[PDB]
Amino acid sequence: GYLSQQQNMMQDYVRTGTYQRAILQNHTDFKDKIVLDVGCGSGILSFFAAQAGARKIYAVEASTMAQHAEVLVKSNNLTDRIVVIPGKVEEVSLPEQVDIIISEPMGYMLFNERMLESYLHAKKYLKPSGNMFPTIGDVHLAPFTDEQLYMEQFTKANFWYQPSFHGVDLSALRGAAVDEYFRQPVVDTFDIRILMAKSVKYTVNFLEAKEGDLHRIEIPFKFHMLHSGLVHGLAFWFDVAFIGSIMTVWLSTAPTEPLTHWYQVRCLFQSPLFAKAGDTLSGTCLLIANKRQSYDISIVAQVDQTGSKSSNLLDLKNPFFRYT
Amino acid sequence: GYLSQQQNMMQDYVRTGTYQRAILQNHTDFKDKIVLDVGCGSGILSFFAAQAGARKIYAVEASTMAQHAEVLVKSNNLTDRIVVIPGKVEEVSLPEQVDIIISEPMGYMLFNERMLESYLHAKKYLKPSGNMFPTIGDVHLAPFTDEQLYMEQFTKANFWYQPSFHGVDLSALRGAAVDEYFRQPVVDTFDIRILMAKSVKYTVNFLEAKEGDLHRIEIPFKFHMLHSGLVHGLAFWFDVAFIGSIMTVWLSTAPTEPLTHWYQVRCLFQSPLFAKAGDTLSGTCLLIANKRQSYDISIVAQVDQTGSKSSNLLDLKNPFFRYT
């Protein structure tokens, strides 16, 4: 509901500028077409669709931020072109099928907040050969070494390892504090030189995907170690592409690209793994959607040349925002 | 119910040390008595009552935090003294009436999160001769001058005065935008030299207050100005006293005292008020309990000599943390 959260999202130039570039540069995908805008987060995408000369734009807004979208449509003299439909996409009805769907459904590792499920759900309104902006999403994973990060977890949990905090013995809760800290994905950016291998990419094609494909995401991985060292976890980021008729525009949140409000996400292993250069780290990353509009993340990895194995179970609902 | 939040509260030494000091210095209010510990923040207070000699402590904890508490009770060998009762005080039953109730029910501006209503509700368990720790809460408010803070909130707000942000006119939402920014209480510390008059005190006596008294809190005020200049808003903080039989121990969050995780809070006026040294600034601060476990705050302030008046609505539900 807050205009301050809208503003903050609009203020990210990468986000707003890239969406606008994607729409205006592919204006023939939009010119005299019918458009569905699902969940106007920054709230501004319906206007870009009108700047590209859309015939009609249905804007589904879910919160009280629906009468605000109404104020903006009226004061920009676009009442004849933009229709604001309050409610959820799974509960509203559109008077007609659309040529294209647009949205900003990306959360922390692409998937967090589960807005992509509404996005896919909206395809019931898509003409059989319509398009989607974004069209595809690429989750990248890569192993990292970060001894300071890993160490900081114990420093914090070891608060509980004292037999007389104000005369109280806290140490029986040290195991639970360690578990809890290790279950938090870390949202922060990093130096790319911490990456110990080329990333593995998992693509979700939004045109082909069904809503149910997101309830459980299995990502196998095989890493070929570029440097010898202790692997402390996996790092996550994502790219999305808008694949129009004129061109493909990419939005990247990679650590090599300018920083966005998505940053990057790291999941630590319980126990680091020694992998030399040339070794293989294989395993699997399993995302299971949960009742808290988030994901449980299951990671298991082994050094194939050695058999030494590690894992973690994380919940994306309680991340540690480490950046400042 | 995270251990990490327990830990953050526990590590506030002013909070933790003063609770222990209030309890041990009044050991005689605890020695051989029945204690009710309501809704653990840190979870630590039952252990202070045990150190003080209580015969029995019923520790009501709602969150899964009840399991963690249970683990500490066993490892500290206090199973005969401290009994965890899961659930809420409004629901649970207790084997017997208690001699004293202890809690950490204070949020920002003392009142935020409304833990005080559960605290007052627990008085149904209190013997007529009983006590409560804390026993009173002093809210202080004082007028302040801070040009930098005011300009800065108006700066964020000014985003929405743009007639063309990426081609879109936002200016229709500018009034809605500044109003929203000015409803955020600013949580931060400040130099004491910015205060324009002696604070005014509003005392809530928890022993005497009924639960519904806290749904509506009217705070009339009149300051005698000690410096001339623009008044940009009202600063708030709170003291709580533990009025034991042996001594009264004050826990203060005043800007003249060491910093606590409560910091202090400032409500800015939509427009500053000019006032001469010697002039009187009177009005009311009015807190109304809302659905979101917080308060609507309405502040009306007048210079009595002049008729200059500035009134402001606030919601303690989304504060601005300026100590970022």
Cα–Cα distance measured from residue B159 to residue B170, given in angstroms and rounded to the nearest whole number: 8
Say which residues have a Cβ less than 8 Å from residue A33's Cβ, sequence separation at least 6: A54, A55, A98, A99, A100
Q: In Å, how far are A16, A158, B219, B265 from B200, measured between CA atoms?
A: 47, 43, 10, 15
For residue B47, give how far its alpha carbon lies from the nearest alpha carbon of chain A (Å): 7
> Annotated catalytic, B188?
no
Q: Select from A322, A319, A316, A318 the least CA-distant residue to A114.
A: A316
Q: Nearest CA to A319 among A189, A190, A184? A: A184
Residues of B in contact with A51 (CB under 8 A): 167
Contact between residue B313 and residue B176 where contact means Cβ atoms under 8 Å apart = no
Contact B142, B223 (CB under 8 A): yes
Residue A185 has a CB neighbour count (10 Å cut-off) of: 26
Taking a C-beta distance cutoff of 8 angstroms, is the pair B140, B236 a contact?
Answer: yes
Which one of B7, B46, B47, B321 makes the best mutation probe of the A interface by having the most chain A beta carbons within 10 Å?
B7
Buried b / exposed e over A10-24, threshold 16 CB at 10 Å, is bebebbbebbbebbb
| A95 contact partners, CB below 8 Å, separation of at least 6 | none
* SS3 per residue for B6-61: HHHHHCCHHHHHHHHHHHHCCHHHCCCCEEEEECCCCCCHHHHHHHHCCCEEEEEE
For tokens 């149904």, name the residue.
Answer: B124
B1 near A CB under 8 A: no
- Whether B313 has its CB under 8 Å from any CB of chain A: the answer is no
Best of A166, A179, A184, A322 to substitute, by most chain B Cβ atoms within 10 angstroms, is: A166
Of B3, B44, B177, the CB nearest to A177: B3
B216, B289 Cβ separation under 8 angstroms: yes
Resolution reading in Å: 2.4
Q: Which residues of chain B are within 8 Å of residue A315 when distances are taken between CB atoms? A: none
A189 C-beta neighbours (distance < 10 Å), count: 15
Instruction: Evaluate the CA torsion angle A197, A198, A199, A203 in order and state its sign.
Output: negative
Q: Which two tokens stand for residue B179?
A: 């109003």
Q: Is there a binding annotation on residue B61?
A: yes
Active site annotation includes B113: yes
A247: amino acid identity, one letter: M
Closest residue by Cα to residue B30 from B39, B19, B41 = B19
Residue A156 at interface with chain B, using a CB cutoff of 8 Å: yes
Domain B136-324: which CATH number of 2.60.120.10, 3.90.950.20, 2.40.10.340, 2.70.160.11 = 2.70.160.11
C-alpha torsion A322→B2→B7→B12, nearest 10 = 90
- B266 phi/psi in degrees, rounded to 5: -125, 130
Considering just the CA atoms, what is the radius of gyration of chain A in Å? 22
Q: Which CATH architecture has domain A1-134?
A: 3-Layer(aba) Sandwich (3.40)
Determine the residue of chain A that is closest to B174 in CA distance: A3
C-alpha to C-alpha distance for A2 and A251, rounded to whole angstroms: 25
Q: Token digits for B233?
A: 């808003």
Query: Which amino acid makes up residue B80?
Result: D
A5 in contact with chain B, both atoms CB, cutoff 8 A: no
**Which candidate from A10, A169, A324 shows the least CB-CB separation from B76?**
A169
| Dihedral, CA of residue A97, residue A100, residue A104 and residue A106, to nearest 10 | 100
Across the interface, of B2, B16, B165, the residue whose CB is closest to A180 is: B2
- Asked if A167 reaches chain B (Cβ–Cβ under 8 Å), the answer is yes
A70 marked among binding-site residues: no
| Segment (H or E) for B298 | strand B294-303
Q: What share of chain A is helix, strand, coil (3-state, %, to 5)?
A: 25, 40, 35
Rounded Cα distance, B210 and A18, in Å: 56
Phi and psi at residue A6, in whole multiples of 5°? -55, -50
Q: How far is it, in rounded angstroms, from Cα A287 to Cα A281?
A: 19
B12 is catalytic: yes
Q: How far apart are CA B1 and CA A42, in angstroms?
A: 32
B261 in active site: yes
DSSP B205-261: ETTT--GGGGGEEEEEEEEE-SS-EEEEEEEEEEEEEEE-SS-EEEEE--TTS---T
Closest CA to A251 of A16, A10, A7, A11: A16
**Whole-number Å distance between alpha carbons of B315 and B288:** 10
CA B122, CA B11: separation in Å to the nearest integer? 27
| CB contact (8 A) between residue A72 and residue B165 | no
Give the residue from A63, A161, A170, A183 with the most B CB atoms within 10 Å of its CB, the best one to mutate.
A170
Closest C-alpha to A320, from A186, A138, A127: A186
Q: Determine the Cα–Cα distance for residues A65 and A43; give it in Å rounded to an integer.
A: 8
Backbone torsions φ then ψ of B271, nearest 5 degrees? -140, 135
CB contact A161 to B (< 8 Å): no
Q: Does B64 touch chain A (CB under 8 A)?
A: no
Nearest CA in chain A to B317: A2
| Residue B154 DSSP SS3 | helix
Q: What are phi and psi of A178, to 5 degrees?
A: -60, -55
CB contact under 8 A, B44 and A180: no
With CB atoms and an 8 Å threshold, state whether A165 touches B10.
yes
Q: A42: buried, middle or exposed (CB in 10 Å: 19+, 13-18, 0-12)? A: middle
Chain B, 122 to 151: residues with Cβ < 8 Å from chain A are none
Q: Give the residue extent of every domain in chain B.
A: 1-134, 136-324
User: Which residue of A lies nearest to B21 if distances are taken between CA atoms?
Assistant: A166
Residues 6+ apart with CB under 8 A from B110: B116, B137, B139, B204, B238, B240
**Whole-angstrom Cα distance, residue A211 to residue A90?**
12
Instruction: Flag whether residue B291 sits within 8 Å of chain A, measured between CB atoms.
Output: no
| CB-based burial label for A203 (10 Å; 0-12, 13-18, 19+) | exposed
Contacts of B193 (CB under 8 A, 6+ apart): none
